[PDB]
Each structure stands twice: as structure tokens, then as C-alpha cells.
């Protein structure tokens, strides 16, 4: 109906394309950043230019035959906080009781002064609520062991210790930076009578996701399919992998020898790849990415890879595209509430647009936009909104493949025995529930330097409740 | 060590290769054969209309149905309770088909077979439903994994046995009536066989029920296929293209809201004239001398598990005839099928770091054949060549069906699900991995393979038959 608008949208969509040359470039560059990040660096190198590459101090992959009594797990994500009790029954089977709760909006508002006690006191109260609901008879009696999944960068110094490096994903609470999050959590657990709950392990949600797969993958699967990566595509994005103790040079040269003599070969590395190429030397970037990064984001100049991929930021990318189109007097935003409401459009809104069909006049897209920001749309307007949404997601799914391809290349995980496949454990609302996201990740992997023959040997498998199960596996190992 | 032998194996392995050009040839020919078979012949693939028009949703729920599945090797009886929400409860008893039915030494008739099946049905009810065996009015779906000239959901005459089965007086007989008669003759007349289906058809219906509603959105199950004792697959075909179907019945189905009918391609018969199928000296020998249906099921005889181990046995004998391979005190000679696909599965992925000990034990257990390490090294090359050819041919019918129905380019992000059942696709190391490799080489390309998901349906046959029982009336 409006040709100038229809051509303006086509032009904005081309800005989101990721070519095979870009995939190859970013794959090779990612490995260079992995190698820079695997070396020791100062507390603050103005330009380290290497990935975080955080040693998680996990050296043993689960077998699936692990067995124990019910453990506890606490997972602080980017959106929800989960508590659960996991009983590992061996033979690749387990029992789980879990309660999930949203992180109250109070914690993401800078209008009020929020502190670390507010946060962990809330987490401890939920821990108590969970035990009162699922273990009412033995809440204050048992000596619970708890694995703590903290989905944020931690300067991990042991399996049970580590200081928060910097918040990400809308969290901003100053007095937590530099604090050992295990003690912070343990402190508020003691102050409500749950001193009998010992937080014996700290892990990232990437690490836990990987550990979960190693346990649940059937012996028949572990035979040919070995899980090699645990990654997340939800509110934020990140992934881990196993690195030879020799290549982890930033690890104490003494500790490496001590671990090696004990029969250990690798240690899990938390790449923290949401920070990948924070200097934007190569990452695809639009004017809307800069605006989100600099103005609306709580961590400007950080997590730039994340800000193009994870579900916390994609819906916001659409909102800025629409406002810019209204600024240019091309798209009528009517009485919508997009203006002056950052992040009002969530990725959950786009998921209803991604696969909406024109055979129903894109009625889901209409309802989703009215429900999310009281925005009315014509059919031609929804058609164009869908083109933008599908371009924003395709870029995210294509970028999502680069860190995976890069890791598989560096560790030569695909050059294995005959018929051997590798398994990539994925968790998060995006990879789990965004229509066609995994399908596009594979398309990118086939374009990556590993090629279609490589993509076929890679299996992106979902591990629901991954974060928590893995933490429990670490709790079973450590002592009370 | 034997250098002349090492070159004989390389030459036999190259004879099993399937190139991308050959896959493309066989795919297009398969589609040509599908279209021929959808025409009347008054006398192309079988392309049998199964009279199934409705795909289950997954929310179906009803009383416990019964199912009886006569495979190529086992006979199963089970009770299926459809609980809706893509879930069901099942109690089943599985039993080998006694060797008496595969021996031509004794005169076998149809009564022998169905009399045995009815007794198994009775035992099952006596063991799992003793209180309501003679009280309830059971509805039973019958899975008959053999070509049937299907004339309705509850009727159809056997066309021809396959897979070692040979019972002459069954050909031309409606197998549902035969089964129902022996059920009545032991008091189980209250068990009504209300539906007849192929194991391909049931496999598809089962997946459509179990495939999560979230999966049904983008992932639609489009094929139910089998890679076990034999091989075969089905799909949904536009009622318009099924010209061999009565033009009247077509019109009535359309008016009732129906659009497609499931087609049993019987793709084990694909290219029985060997106009294009890869053929070795050993395939002819199996077809002409050792097979129970010479000149039939030739595609099957190169793919399914009943024949792959036998292909190795003939390769070994030929190498011994040529005084190249020492067969020791083995019993391979004059013992067809003594080498099973289950024997090859232990060889496929055996490693040299263990001196290929699995292959050694597997060969001794199956035919008291001792082997040196270098001999096992070469036997592994043969096994891997036989299986790769099977998995590559196995991809052709799937690609062909997906192309004919243009199932992959139906909407943005559209994926298709192929339901697979059978000991080979389920449990043969790397079989699915090689099938996908072939699909990527097929005319659908790597972009197509990625949109295709080979999903396993363990207990499909029976659940699908139960879903047909729920529909039909007592
Ligand atoms: O939740 C996914 C990822 O989000 C990122 O912001 C954090 O830095 C990671 O630790 C986490 O794994
Ligand atoms: O069991 C797999 C297939 O084997 C073939 O021999 C039969 O003719 C088919 O009806 C059956 O579906």
C-alpha cells in the first residue's frame, strides 16, 4: 500500500543479514578471543581483547550412574528464581520437585535503592517456602546440601567460592560486585533458621546445563553422542566447554600439575560469550543496537553479543525500529504505548509474530501487539512488522551458532571415531520455545567452517530443568 | 596380511557405493513409480489406499482398546488406553513367531496361524484382564505387516507373503475374517477385530498422537515408515491423486470433510525389475536362491535387517571359494541367514583399540567362525559398506515422498517429522546418521535434510491400530 515504507523495511532487514563470510570471520575471531582469554590478564586491562574464559573448577563429567539422596538446588536466572529438590537415582534417571518464581520488579528499578540483603533474603525466603511445601517434616532437621546456580559472571576461585564480577541483564545492585555470592546467600539462609542448608557448590547455568546432559544422556546415547557444550539462549546467552588443563594458562601453573596427577584431563570453561567482541570490531551492528547498548541498557559497553542474541533484547530492537519509522513519518503508531517504555515489547511477543500466517490476516500478530502495547495495526502493517521480526531473529540465531562452531573447531570435537556425533545441551526460553530458532542455528552451522557434514554430527538437544540438576550433581560431590 | 585378499575387499566395498547422482536417479524414478501406482491396473508401486483419512490429534481419549501386531519375526498383543494429552497406557506380551511357520517341510495352512494368534490373544486377556475377558465387548485393531488389497478399514485380502513367511492358502483371503473366525472358535467372539492396518500406517498414526501439540505446530508427521525385518512406509495423499480409488468413494469422502487418504507405498517392491537399483552378484544370489519370494521385494532385500547379514555371508563364501579367506571350522556354508543384522551391529562400530574383540565374539557366537585381527579388520570394511548402502537406499523413498507432496516448503520454518520403527533404524549404530547423509545428497539437499526429523516410534504399530479401533464401531 505504501511503497516508500515497504522499501524502507526491506532496507532495514538487509542490515540484519549475516553472510557466510561474516560467520566464518566471527568463528575464527572467536577462537582468537578464546585464546587471548585463556591467558592470565590484569585485574583490569584497558584492552585485554580476550573472552572472560572463566575456569569453573569442574573437571569430571557425570556418568549417569551417580546415585544419592535428595539434594537441593537454587537457580537465580535473569527472569526467574528456582528452587528444587533432586534425587539422583542412577542409570540416567532422577526425581525432581521444583517451584519457580519471577524475580519481583522491585529489584530492577533504580528509583528505589536496592541492596544485596534484599535479594538474598528474598532467595532464602523462597528456599524456606519450597522446603515447607515439599519437605515439611524435615525442613529444620536434615542437613541439606545445595548447589547454587548463579547465571552471572563470577570470578570463580573454587567449586564453592567466587565473587560476582559484574551484573548483567537488567540487574543493577552495586554492593554485590566483588562479593562472594555463596556467602551472601549462605548468610541470609542462616538468618531465617535454614543454617542447616549448606550451599556447597557454585556454578553457572551453562556448566549445570552441560552436567545435566552428561547424566541424562542414555548409555546408548553417550556411546556415540558425547555431550560437549552446555549453553543457554534465554534472557541472556552464554555457553561452556571442556578445555585441556594444559591450555588453561590463566590457571595457577601449580594447580594444573596437581590436578593432572590426580587423573584429571580437562576443566570446564565458562566462556561468558555474551561479552564476545565488546569492542564491536566485527560484530554486526545497527543504529538500534548502539541505542539499546548506550541508552536503555543497564550495562553500556558490555554484553554486546548478548544484546543482539538473547531474548531480553530482541523485542526491544523491534520497538526502536518502529519508533525510528515513526520519526521518519512512515509508520503510524497511533495511541500505542511504545513511546517512553523501553523493553515493553518482549521476545515472547515476537514469538507470536515469527510464524503467524497471512491466511488468518496475521491475527495473532494483531492481538500480540494490542496486548503488549495497545498498538493497532492494519494487515499491511503487520506484514511488515513480521518481516522485521523475522530478520531480527534470523540474525540472533545465526550469531548464536558462531560460538558453538568456534568451540567445536578449537577442541576438534567432530574428528572422532566412525559414526560419532556430539551433543550440545541448550536451555532457555528462546532456544526452547521461539519458533524456528534452532532451525536457523543449524542453517548457520551448515554455513560455518564446519559445513553441512559437520552440522549433521551436531545435535542441539534441549535440557529442561538443566541449571538445577547440574548444580545438584555438584552438591552430591562436595561435602556438607 | 594377505595382500591379494586386501584388494579383493576394497573391490567388493566399492561395488556397494551409492553416489549422489544415483540417489537423484532413484528418487525421481521412485516418484514416477508412485504416480504409476496411483492409477488403476485391472490385473508402478503398489500404492495401496488404506482407507485412513483422519490423522489423530493427541487429545483422543477412550476406553482400553486391543491391538494385535503380526510382524515378520514376532507377534504382539496389547491393551492400549488412550488418555488424551498425547499419553496412553499399554500392557503387552511379545512372542517369537515359532519356526514351524517358516518351514516348508511341513504343510502349513491359514488356520494354523490364526489359531495360534487367537490363543495368544486369549492368554493375554487371561493374564492381564482375567476378570473381564468374556464380559467386555472388546474392540481390536489388527496390524498385519504384509501387503493387503485393502478394501475398507476392516477388510482386505493378502496379496503375497514376504520375509520368510510362506502360507499359500492365505493369498486372496481376507485376513480379518480369518482372524475373527479363530477368535470366535475359542469363545472370544466378544473380541471384534474392527480395524486392519499396516505397520507403516500405525506408526504414522501413533506419532501423530504422541507428537506433542507444540510439535504438531511446526513439526507435522508426514511419513510412517519401517526399517526392521522388512522395510516399507506410508504417507498422506490427496484423494484427487488416488485415481485407482473408486471415483464415487472419493466424492463422498470429500463431502464428509476429508482431504487425503493414507497410502501404503509398499516401497520394498520399488524397482523389482532392477531397472535402476544397485545390484551385486550377492544380491542376485539372495534373491534367486535364498529368498522365499524370488523376484520380489528387491529394494527390501538390499536394506532390511532380514537380508543384510546374509549379504555378508555370501561375500565371505565367495572369498573362500576364491581361496582368499580361511573359513576355519565355521558353519556359514549351507546355512542361509545364520549371520543376522544383529551380528553386523556388533561389527559396525567395533574399534581396533580392543583388537576388534566384539567382531571376534560376535562371529564365534553366530557361526563358530574364528578370525585373525587382520581378518576382522577387513570384515569390518565389508559390514560398513553393506550398511552404508542400505541407509543410503533407505533415504530414497523418503526424499521421493517429501518431494512429490512438496511437504518441506509449506510455511516459514516448516519442519516435517518422519516416524520410524524397526530394529534396524532403532538400534543399528549410525544407520540414521547415514540416512541423513543420503537425504542431504538427495534432491532436497542439506537445506532439506535439516527440515526433516527422523523420530523413533517404539510401540507405534499397536497404538496406531488401537486408534483405528477407537474410531470404528463394535
Ligand atoms: O543466563 C544466560 C547468561 O546470561 C549472561 O548475562 C551471564 O553473564 C551468564 O553467566 C549467563 O549464563
Ligand atoms: O515390516 C515392514 C514391511 O515389510 C514388508 O515385507 C511388508 O510387505 C510390509 O507390509 C511391511 O510394512
Swiss-Prot record, chain A:
Domain (Hexokinase): residue spans on this chain: 3-476
Annotated region (Hexokinase small subdomain), positions in chain: 63-203
Any GO CC annotation of this UniProt entry: cytosol
CDD domains, sorted: ASKHA_NBD_GLK1-2_fungi (cd24088)
Keyword Electron transport attributed: no
Family the UniProt entry places it in: Belongs to the hexokinase family.
Claim: ATP-binding is one of the keywords in the record: yes
Superkingdom per UniProt: Eukaryota
Matches recorded under Pfam families: Hexokinase_1, Hexokinase_2
Region spans: Hexokinase large subdomain: 204-465
EC id: 2.7.1.2, 2.7.1.1
InterPro entries in UniProt: ATPase_NBD (IPR043129), Hexokinase (IPR001312), Hexokinase_BS (IPR019807), Hexokinase_C (IPR022673), Hexokinase_N (IPR022672)
Catalytic activity: D-glucose + ATP = D-glucose 6-phosphate + ADP + H(+); a D-hexose + ATP = a D-hexose 6-phosphate + ADP + H(+); D-mannose + ATP = D-mannose 6-phosphate + ADP + H(+)
Protein name (Swiss-Prot/TrEMBL): Glucokinase-1
UniProt enzyme class: transferase
Species for this entry: Kluyveromyces lactis (strain ATCC 8585 / CBS 2359 / DSM 70799 / NBRC 1267 / NRRL Y-1140 / WM37) (Yeast)
GO biological process: glucose metabolic process; glycolytic process; intracellular glucose homeostasis
Keywords: ATP-binding, Glycolysis, Kinase, Nucleotide-binding, Transferase
Gene Ontology MF: a single term: mannokinase activity
Residues reported to bind ATP: 100, 465-470
Associated pathway: Carbohydrate metabolism; hexose metabolism; Carbohydrate degradation; glycolysis; D-glyceraldehyde 3-phosphate and glycerone phosphate from D-glucose: step 1/4
Function: Glukokinase specific for aldohexoses. Phosphorylates glucose and mannose, but not fructose.
Positions of the UniProt region annotated as Glucose-binding: 145-171
